[PDB]
Design a protein around this ligand. Structure first.
Ligand code: PAR
Ligand code: MG
Ligand code: MG
Ligand code: MG
Ligand code: MG
Ligand code: MG
Ligand code: MG
Ligand code: MG
Ligand code: MG
Ligand code: MG
Ligand code: MG
Ligand code: MG
Ligand code: MG
Ligand code: MG
Ligand code: MG
Ligand code: MG
Ligand code: MG
Ligand code: MG
Ligand code: MG
Ligand code: MG
Ligand code: MG
Ligand code: MG
Ligand code: MG
Ligand code: MG
Ligand code: MG
Ligand code: MG
Ligand code: MG
Ligand code: MG
Ligand code: MG
Ligand code: MG
Ligand code: MG
Ligand code: MG
Ligand code: MG
Ligand code: MG
Ligand code: MG
Ligand code: MG
Ligand code: MG
Ligand code: MG
Ligand code: MG
Ligand code: MG
Ligand code: MG
Ligand code: MG
Ligand code: MG
Ligand code: MG
Ligand code: MG
Ligand code: MG
Ligand code: MG
Ligand code: MG
Ligand code: MG
Ligand code: MG
Ligand code: MG
Ligand code: MG
Ligand code: MG
Ligand code: MG
Ligand code: MG
Ligand code: MG
Ligand code: MG
Ligand code: MG
Ligand code: MG
Ligand code: MG
Ligand code: MG
Ligand code: MG
Ligand code: MG
Ligand code: MG
Ligand code: MG
Ligand code: MG
Ligand code: MG
Ligand code: MG
Ligand code: MG
Ligand code: MG
Ligand code: MG
Ligand code: MG
Ligand code: MG
Ligand code: MG
Ligand code: MG
Ligand code: MG
Ligand code: MG
Ligand code: MG
Ligand code: MG
Ligand code: MG
Ligand code: MG
Ligand code: MG
Ligand code: MG
Ligand code: MG
Ligand code: MG
Ligand code: MG
Ligand code: MG
Ligand code: MG
Ligand code: MG
Ligand code: MG
Ligand code: MG
Ligand code: MG
Ligand code: MG
Ligand code: MG
Ligand code: MG
Ligand code: MG
Ligand code: MG
Ligand code: MG
Ligand code: MG
Ligand code: MG
Ligand code: MG
Ligand code: MG
Ligand code: MG
Ligand code: MG
Ligand code: MG
Ligand code: MG
Ligand code: MG
Ligand code: MG
Ligand code: MG
Ligand code: MG
Ligand code: MG
Ligand code: MG
Ligand code: MG
Ligand code: MG
Ligand code: MG
Ligand code: MG
Ligand code: MG
Ligand code: MG
Ligand code: MG
Ligand code: MG
Ligand code: MG
Ligand code: MG
Ligand code: MG
Ligand code: MG
Ligand code: MG
Ligand code: MG
Ligand code: MG
Ligand code: MG
Ligand code: MG
Ligand code: MG
Ligand code: MG
Ligand code: MG
Ligand code: MG
Ligand code: MG
Ligand code: MG
Ligand code: MG
Ligand code: MG
Ligand code: MG
Ligand code: MG
Ligand code: MG
Ligand code: MG
Ligand code: MG
Ligand code: MG
Ligand code: MG
Ligand code: MG
Ligand code: MG
Ligand code: MG
Ligand code: MG
Ligand code: MG
Ligand code: MG
Ligand code: MG
Ligand code: MG
Ligand code: MG
Ligand code: MG
Ligand code: MG
Ligand code: MG
Ligand code: MG
Ligand code: MG
Ligand code: MG
Ligand code: MG
Ligand code: MG
Ligand code: MG
Ligand code: MG
Ligand code: MG
Lengths: 271, 48
RNA sequence: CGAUGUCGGCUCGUCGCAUCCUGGGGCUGAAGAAGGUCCCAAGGGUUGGGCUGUUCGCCCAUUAAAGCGGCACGCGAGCUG
RNA sequence: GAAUGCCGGCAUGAGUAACGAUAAAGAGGGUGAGAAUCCCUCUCGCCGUAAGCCCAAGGGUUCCUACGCAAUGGUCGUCAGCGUAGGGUUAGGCGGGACCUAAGGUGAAGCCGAAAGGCGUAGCCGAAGGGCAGCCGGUUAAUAUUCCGGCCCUUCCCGCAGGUGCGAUGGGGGGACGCUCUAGGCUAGGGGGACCGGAGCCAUGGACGAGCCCGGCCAGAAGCGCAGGGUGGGAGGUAGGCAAAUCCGCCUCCCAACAAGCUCUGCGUGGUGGGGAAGCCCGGGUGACAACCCCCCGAAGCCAGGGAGCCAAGAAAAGCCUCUAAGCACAACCUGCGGGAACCCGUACCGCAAACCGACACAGGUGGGCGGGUGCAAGAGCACUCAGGCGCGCGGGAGAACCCUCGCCAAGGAACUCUGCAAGUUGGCCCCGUAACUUCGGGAGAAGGGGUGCUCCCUGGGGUGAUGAGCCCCGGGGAGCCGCAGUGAACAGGCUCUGGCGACUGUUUACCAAAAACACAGCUCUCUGCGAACUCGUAAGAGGAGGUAUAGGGAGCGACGCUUGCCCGGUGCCGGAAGGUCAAGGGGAGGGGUGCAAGCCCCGAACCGAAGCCCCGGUGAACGGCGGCCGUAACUAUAACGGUCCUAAGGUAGCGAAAUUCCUUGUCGGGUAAGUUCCGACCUGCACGAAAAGCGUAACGACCGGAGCGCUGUCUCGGCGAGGGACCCGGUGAAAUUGAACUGGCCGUGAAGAUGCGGCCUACCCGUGGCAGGACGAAAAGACCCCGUGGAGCUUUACUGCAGCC
RNA sequence: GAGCUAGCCCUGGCCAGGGUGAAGCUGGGGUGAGACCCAGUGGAGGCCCGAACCGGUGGGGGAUGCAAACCCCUCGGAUGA
RNA sequence: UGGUUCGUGGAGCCAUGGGGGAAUCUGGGCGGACCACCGCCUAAGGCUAAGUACUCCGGGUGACCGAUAGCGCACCAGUAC
RNA sequence: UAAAAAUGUUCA
RNA sequence: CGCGGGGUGGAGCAGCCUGGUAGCUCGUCGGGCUCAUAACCCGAAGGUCGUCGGUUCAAAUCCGGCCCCCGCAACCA
RNA sequence: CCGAGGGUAGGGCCCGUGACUGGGGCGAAGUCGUAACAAGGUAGCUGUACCGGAAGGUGCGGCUGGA
RNA sequence: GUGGGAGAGGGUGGUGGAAUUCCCGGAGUAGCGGUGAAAUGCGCAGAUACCGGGAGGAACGCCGAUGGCGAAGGCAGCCACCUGGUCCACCCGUGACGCUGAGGCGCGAAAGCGUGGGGAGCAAACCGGAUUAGAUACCCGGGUAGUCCACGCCCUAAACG
């Protein structure tokens, strides 16, 4: 829905915030081996290796189950649906019947008190996670593994989803949320349905700060940076790049295709 | 106004310490000049 | 050039005469009153504003008149900047 | 003798500048060889969210005491943070270590690197974080929750008695936690009292007066009250806690639930211990066997992991409970009571400062805690002031110019000036009352006003009490009094109209620039399918991300509104399994050197040969680019229309002498007495123009421009006055500079602006206060300019490489 | 050499008192149900005044300084990038 | 690619990252491309004094200094600062 | 579902 | 002052570089189609190549001198 | 105490005027095309939308006031 | 009220095939395309034509009618769910409870606007090819908004019988 705010202060007239209904009932995270200390600094060993990171709300990590194929066929009651500050998406707290509880990325429509389960056995309904090969062609699914047994790595952003286009051999073919068209192993597991909280794309940070809250430091164009600093830098007072667009490292930044030509992954893709 | 030297005894031993020098191969190679030169202090004097 | 700090303003001036004013004077196509031109004469005077950083100008209101130049385009170990 | 040479010494300026914040001093006693400067006393002024107390860091004996003053003290010194000597820092419960983990460091394994070395698992190290047992008084010249007195705790080991399956570095629980706003009880703290306890006091007209003055506490186990925090009990099953568990987690069900009980803190009380003014008499006595009570205010602290709302969603490990495993149940833990045992390190003193950082007893810098009273609405603000600490280490006089800091000014009133720069007016609270414009929030504290003291009477609410007196806390209504004046002192905006640029809060050139610059939400392009792209690294590895296209990186543009046109010829990037070209390599026609030869050697043509370039197309919020000349309408003018040339296409919308207009103070219009600035227009726009965005835009702005009103020394035009210097006396006593000097004017001459040459004219010798024209005055071997086949940083379709990528 | 300065990481601390008055609630009105409009309560805010504190805007002093960036007056922000 | 005087040069020899890859003396390497004679020597394991270098230390000389010289230190200097 | 085709001064 | 571009029928442009030959489009003139006008069709005329010389046998063309045209530059203190 | 009016300040209604600018009416024989009235030589008109010297053109839907 | 009937009335979810375009695979050649005629364009880097396989969007042929429903705008594959209006018979029930309707409220083709998505075909603007004295038109080859969906606006029309 996104809340809006009355213009009683600018920066806060364009501001909007998440609809927080779908969550409630649980906001304190499930301590039980669920949070971890989350280490959190911009660079690597010494040097900053991603410009413009830092500051921004102290934040805790929810370890979430990304490969549901452990507790196979074990069913599980969804306890609630909460907020995870390490993702755009919502995560739901489920309780399996083992007693064992795990976090999982919470697809659209998933409502508290649902039974839900993983395996091939499983029925094609939201929140249930099957090996793609067992999933009915042209249904929407999410949190797809890529190479099987290597976990979920596709479709996990707020309101994204891959759809199936049909099989061919051991591989099924999915349109990823980018639109690309990847042959994917049927043995890859994937929980059905769209990731929801898709009103995300709709929110407006509004002020300079807010951004900071998420620890995104201010950013500076190449211009206004001296020539030593950057391609675009220099010139007596505001000047049209210079020809042509470049990263402060030297590479064309409009257009110049980047992936490895000779990569093996090529020949599974098509889009 | 806040000047350059702002003493801190922990920072002094940690930085120009002895165990401090001996780590780095450059630091060992300090002691050498120092000791060969006949300094009375191979290390900044700062007590606890 | 092992440096004589540059425009304009302000302060303080001083000197020249090819005198703007006042004082003399000869012509006049000088009736009178006004003027025109030239000669002698700086002794002393030679205003206040609007515009522009301006010197310079162009305006407003006056005035006997509202002179023109030199002094490292006088004057920053006096000020401004 | 010369190198702005090197070292040392000593001169000059100079008995000059200055003696480090304009908080301030005076006198009488002492001590002494001598003291405005040391000791004492009485006045006076200054600080008091302090220039006052308590810590932390740093310093490191500076602390105390006895002797001293040569030098250190910008003067003096009989003083000292100074010299000499001697004393002085006492803990099982405070802080740190024989406890824990954070970032990070190290690092058995393991991986990597010519070497030196670099990563890195477990582990260990690592703290103003978690954990953990002391409160109050007394003593010393100097130490103490460290000695002592009282009251109260903590662990270990051992012994005795009574209870229980005890038992791990392993399992689970717990520790455990954001921001903002608040509930109720207390406590710290504070204000009163006609009460209690006290030496004294009526002093100058009056008052023995419920008068004045001073003080009416602190700690304290068990037990008990009063506030709260934590908390459902069951019985079965169990595919989870890498199940070893009756523990946790899951289900299923007799009970119970804006509770009760158990339990843990806070506060009150408490056996009892301790403290106990003013004043007066020499730190001690006395004030005493002191009094040690009642009411009111009341926290930013305590009960606290309490509650509510919000999103950007908020440490870890140990101690601490609990569960079982090996093992052991003569073990062993658990609960009482006893005895014993309890180490190492810091305890001085300075601590917003003369004992720390600034070479100096440097008007600078320095984290945490307490920070009293009264009044001004409140408050850590302001004025005075407790306690407590200060008068800042050179003084005494004189009162000129001039300088600083400050007060007042007739008439005018920005006439000053680059600019009202500076200063002034305004200025708190309460109540009226407020426009265009607007994204409806704003613009507003718009503007423009009125009130603002004290006295008496009447009257409305609340908190504490008991609904009733006090005690505070918010009011409303009448009359009256005094002044030039009532936030009568101090701290508290000048206002408006209209342009430019940037939306806005924010950021920046530490030491000349805070802005129209950077950033900013938002907009678009582009890359990246995830051992992602990209970055760092020789690599291992790490960041990206314990993320995954509603995700990440790069680029530009910059809220929002309305929009963002045409050309891909060229450069770039994207797409083209045909072609041309192309390097090794394949291939070997054919040639050559040698040997008597088998042979061994050389070169070597077609042809087959990648990327790259060529070629073909695509692509502008990719780099970029978006013309000329001549003619034409029934007045003249102009040119809807036409002709022709060139281009890849030839600037559209919207702006326009504009932060862009040279000619230009373009030409009209407005404002003014007068306006090269400003505002509004026109528009041969020398050189606007659409995301290096275009045109607008409410609100914002220590931004830049124009105009009013109000008020003023800014000015006409100056004047008077205050203090701090300047001057005089005493004390201490520098500096740059300096070829030597017995260092006048003019007219000249001279390397072309002479004190030093010529002629002439003036001119007794020496200082003090002033002024600054000259000594081409000082200062920096000119920053500008040129030169040096001098040097750097930067750029690119300069050359040659290299990393990287193909 | 990051014991100054710039950034980031872990862990603590600090921000008097005022002034506006968002959403949510609660009540009343409205409608077929609504949207919605009124009061009261409520404390939102890179909100406002204003210390502390963080800055350093304009002017004056200072310029062998108290100081190798200081002092006076004035001024920006001050629950937030 | 390096080494040697050898900076591709007629460039061998000695090393050796990459590719191919023998034989044991009718076996192999060299004598500066390359063959033919004629000679030299024996690869792909290792050790080995002496003559050579330096002098922190001791000794002896000095057409060496004699305290702004001689070592930075003739002196409690690699100190004070 | 039809080919290429503009124009005609004023007043009666 | 500098550097470089251009004056060619009435209008706009070609022709000059490697001298002999001036071409395209429009206009203009005659003639057609129509009833007329345009349009269209058939025909033709029209140029001192800015100018003053000199090179050549020959110059729009190659060479210097001016006259107008148009652009670029004019900087540092 | 009211109190005519005067002064200060900020509003609202109206009239006149203003460089410049928008479109309109009207004025015998100016210029450019000819959109419309006969399938007016692309049937016409229409609401909207963009574009163009100009009538106008085209897209989308509609009418018939055409076939 | 009772009992029956016809209908593209509306909203929602699901679904079927034809055709167009593109991708892949196969086969096969030199032209395809388009027009009044041409050219632009496309194609021997292997197009057009034919076969197979896949994606995607929009619209729904035959029935379909001079038909039906709706208050209007408007409504046409098929299925199901939710839901409006309407006609008939039986003459049973209430007792004039009625008609109209300034305001108000609601709906309202197309184009257009906002936020997301989607994009096969078509197609304002725009480019090119022609046609013409000029063509910023008509015809041709391309082509972006838009056309489509959700939600929120606009709310006009020869919204005409
Ligand atoms: N009044 C009519 C409206 O205005 C215009 O009409 C005005 C003009 O267009 C029109 O001008 C015409 C012109 O159209 C036509 N082709 C040629 C004619 N000579 C002109 O005539 C006009 O000008 C001349 C003087 O030159 C006058 O004498 C004459 O009266 C006048 N009508 O004359 C009108 C002025 O009188 C619109 N064209 C018309 O469509 C519109 O409805
Ligand atoms: Mg490191
Ligand atoms: Mg930026
Ligand atoms: Mg710059
Ligand atoms: Mg570049
Ligand atoms: Mg560069
Ligand atoms: Mg520029
Ligand atoms: Mg550039
Ligand atoms: Mg320390
Ligand atoms: Mg010079
Ligand atoms: Mg000199
Ligand atoms: Mg004369
Ligand atoms: Mg001026
Ligand atoms: Mg003069
Ligand atoms: Mg001068
Ligand atoms: Mg000066
Ligand atoms: Mg001078
Ligand atoms: Mg001078
Ligand atoms: Mg000499
Ligand atoms: Mg000197
Ligand atoms: Mg000397
Ligand atoms: Mg002197
Ligand atoms: Mg003097
Ligand atoms: Mg003096
Ligand atoms: Mg005072
Ligand atoms: Mg005395
Ligand atoms: Mg005082
Ligand atoms: Mg210490
Ligand atoms: Mg002492
Ligand atoms: Mg003594
Ligand atoms: Mg002494
Ligand atoms: Mg002394
Ligand atoms: Mg001493
Ligand atoms: Mg540890
Ligand atoms: Mg390491
Ligand atoms: Mg600790
Ligand atoms: Mg602690
Ligand atoms: Mg003490
Ligand atoms: Mg004790
Ligand atoms: Mg057992
Ligand atoms: Mg047990
Ligand atoms: Mg544990
Ligand atoms: Mg409370
Ligand atoms: Mg207490
Ligand atoms: Mg009291
Ligand atoms: Mg009393
Ligand atoms: Mg009494
Ligand atoms: Mg008396
Ligand atoms: Mg107490
Ligand atoms: Mg209780
Ligand atoms: Mg239970
Ligand atoms: Mg086990
Ligand atoms: Mg007590
Ligand atoms: Mg006593
Ligand atoms: Mg020990
Ligand atoms: Mg102590
Ligand atoms: Mg102490
Ligand atoms: Mg302090
Ligand atoms: Mg002092
Ligand atoms: Mg100090
Ligand atoms: Mg000091
Ligand atoms: Mg401070
Ligand atoms: Mg106070
Ligand atoms: Mg106050
Ligand atoms: Mg104060
Ligand atoms: Mg002093
Ligand atoms: Mg005056
Ligand atoms: Mg007066
Ligand atoms: Mg003036
Ligand atoms: Mg003036
Ligand atoms: Mg107004
Ligand atoms: Mg305004
Ligand atoms: Mg205003
Ligand atoms: Mg700004
Ligand atoms: Mg702000
Ligand atoms: Mg600066
Ligand atoms: Mg500044
Ligand atoms: Mg600023
Ligand atoms: Mg900047
Ligand atoms: Mg925008
Ligand atoms: Mg990670
Ligand atoms: Mg993105
Ligand atoms: Mg991006
Ligand atoms: Mg910009
Ligand atoms: Mg192009
Ligand atoms: Mg290109
Ligand atoms: Mg191209
Ligand atoms: Mg290519
Ligand atoms: Mg070859
Ligand atoms: Mg190739
Ligand atoms: Mg034309
Ligand atoms: Mg203009
Ligand atoms: Mg002008
Ligand atoms: Mg311009
Ligand atoms: Mg004018
Ligand atoms: Mg203007
Ligand atoms: Mg521009
Ligand atoms: Mg553009
Ligand atoms: Mg641009
Ligand atoms: Mg801009
Ligand atoms: Mg603009
Ligand atoms: Mg600001
Ligand atoms: Mg500003
Ligand atoms: Mg004085
Ligand atoms: Mg003296
Ligand atoms: Mg001379
Ligand atoms: Mg002489
Ligand atoms: Mg002389
Ligand atoms: Mg003198
Ligand atoms: Mg002088
Ligand atoms: Mg002087
Ligand atoms: Mg000089
Ligand atoms: Mg020089
Ligand atoms: Mg230079
Ligand atoms: Mg050079
Ligand atoms: Mg730092
Ligand atoms: Mg209601
Ligand atoms: Mg409300
Ligand atoms: Mg604020
Ligand atoms: Mg503020
Ligand atoms: Mg302020
Ligand atoms: Mg202040
Ligand atoms: Mg700063
Ligand atoms: Mg100054
Ligand atoms: Mg000065
Ligand atoms: Mg301030
Ligand atoms: Mg070599
Ligand atoms: Mg080899
Ligand atoms: Mg040999
Ligand atoms: Mg040989
Ligand atoms: Mg040999
Ligand atoms: Mg050997
Ligand atoms: Mg001797
Ligand atoms: Mg020596
Ligand atoms: Mg001697
Ligand atoms: Mg020496
Ligand atoms: Mg005509
Ligand atoms: Mg006619
Ligand atoms: Mg007529
Ligand atoms: Mg020509
Ligand atoms: Mg011509
Ligand atoms: Mg000829
Ligand atoms: Mg003819
Ligand atoms: Mg210049
Ligand atoms: Mg009255
Ligand atoms: Mg006419
Ligand atoms: Mg038509
Ligand atoms: Mg027509
Ligand atoms: Mg027609
Ligand atoms: Mg018709
Ligand atoms: Mg239309
Ligand atoms: Mg138009
Ligand atoms: Mg068109
Ligand atoms: Mg139509
Ligand atoms: Mg094919
Ligand atoms: Mg029905
Ligand atoms: Mg529509
Ligand atoms: Mg539009
Ligand atoms: Mg749309
Ligand atoms: Mg088409
Ligand atoms: Mg025609
Ligand atoms: Mg078309
Ligand atoms: Mg509509
Ligand atoms: Mg009809």
């Amino acid at each position: 829905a996104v809340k809006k705010f009355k213009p009683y202060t600018p920066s806060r007239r364009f501001m909007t915030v998440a609809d927080f209904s779908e969550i409630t009932k649980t906001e304190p995270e499930k301590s039980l081996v669920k949070p971890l200390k989350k280490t959190g600094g911009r660079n690597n060993q010494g040097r900053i290796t991603v410009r413009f990171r830092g500051g921004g709300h102290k934040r805790l990590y929810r370890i979430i189950d990304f490969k549901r194929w452990d507790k196979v066929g074990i069913p599980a009651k969804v306890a609630a649906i909460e907020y995870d500050p390490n993702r755009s998406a919502r995560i739901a707290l489920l309780h399996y019947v083992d007693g064992e509880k795990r976090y999982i990325i919470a697809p659209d429509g998933l409502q508290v008190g649902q039974q839900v389960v993983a395996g091939p056995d499983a029925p094609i309904q939201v929140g249930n996670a099957l090996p793609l090969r067992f999933i009915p062609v042209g249904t929407v699914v999410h949190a797809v593994e890529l190479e099987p047994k290597k976990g979920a790595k596709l479709a996990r952003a707020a309101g994204t989803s891959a759809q199936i286009q049909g099989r061919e051999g051991d591989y099924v073919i999915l349109r990823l949320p980018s639109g690309e068209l990847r042959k994917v192993h049927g043995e890859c597991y994937a929980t059905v349905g769209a990731v929801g909280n898709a009103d995300h794309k709709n929110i407006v940070l509004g002020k300079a700060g807010r951004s900071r809250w998420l620890g995104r430091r201010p950013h500076v164009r190449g211009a206004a940076m001296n020539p030593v600093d950057h391609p675009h830098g220099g010139g007596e007072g505001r000047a049209p790049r210079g020809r042509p667009p470049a990263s402060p490292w030297g590479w064309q930044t409009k257009g110049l295709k980047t992936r490895k030509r000779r990569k093996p992954s090529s020949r599974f893709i098509i889009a | 106004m806040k000047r350059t030297w702002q003493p801190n005894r922990r920072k002094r031993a940690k930085t120009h310490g002895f165990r401090a020098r001996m780590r780095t191969p450059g630091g060992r190679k300090v002691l050498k000049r120092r000791r060969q030169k006949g300094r009375w202090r191979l290390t900044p004097a700062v007590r606890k």
